[PDB]
Amino acid sequence: KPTIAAVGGYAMNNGTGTTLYTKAADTRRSTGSTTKIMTAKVVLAQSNLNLDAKVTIQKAYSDYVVANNASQAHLIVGDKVTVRQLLYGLMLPSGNDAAYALADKYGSGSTRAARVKSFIGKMNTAATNLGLHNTHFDSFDGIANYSTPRDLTKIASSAMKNSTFRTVVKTKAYTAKTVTKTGSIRTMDTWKNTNGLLSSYSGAIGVKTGSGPEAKYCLVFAATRGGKTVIGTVLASTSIPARESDATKIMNYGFAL
Secondary structure, rough: OOOOOOOOEEEEEEOOOOEEEEOOOOOEEHHHHHHHHHHHHHHHOOOOOOOOOEEOOOOOHHHHHHHOOOOOOOOOOOOOEEEHHHHHHHHHOOHHHHHHHHHHHHOOOOOOOHHHHHHHHHHHHHHHHOOOOOOEEOOOOOOEEOOOOHHHHHHHHHOOOOHHHHHOOOOOOOOEEEEOOOOEEOOOOOOOOOOOHHHHHOOOEEEEEEEEEOOOOEEEEEEEEEOOEEEEEEEEEHHHHHHHHHHHHHHHHHHHO
8 A cells, every 4th residue: 555645545446436545535624626626517417508608707707816816717807708618727727717607607596696605505415416425515616615535536436427527637738719808719828737647647537636725735536547447536745746646656556456
């Protein structure tokens, strides 16, 4: 069993559900931006979903990232951005402006505030439906927001069942071509996936990096080799390189087991 810097860790065979690795697998910790995995999952599960539906970037999304100095997809207010592009903005650069736009769009209510509260409730419902007991969401971006390496791994596994989700998370780079306030086509600067495993770990297919003041450095990873898919989560590692080596060690162990 490898030694990892993360205080929390878990991994299972994605296809069979058999546990391959544990380290405080059921101990609750802050999740930070790995929360975005649930945001995507909820969106992709909407009955009224339309990937080509365009959303107008509101000033509120922009002010939101500035007010928190948070990660962003650099969405320009006034631009028309499709739900599909928003999913890439959410998952690759970990855009909190994109998350807001998605929560606003798929939450139920007559005001943005109401729809956001509704969206987060949808996130908790999704967790309950998965039979989880150690996961709770207080936000749509991860900015009372906790989970565990096991719970998060199950959430990711469920999300990986959606082909669109799988496509997004394994994409290393994506350039959004948005529609300007005046009808023009804008070529945004290229979005790069923050998950370094996609290029460092052979077979890597996901899923999403995460971090936060309390969550520290997190990573939900997945890779396939020989038709065998290992999916796991590392919570509260000590750094970006450490989170990656932690995941690498667990995956190698899981494949050799």
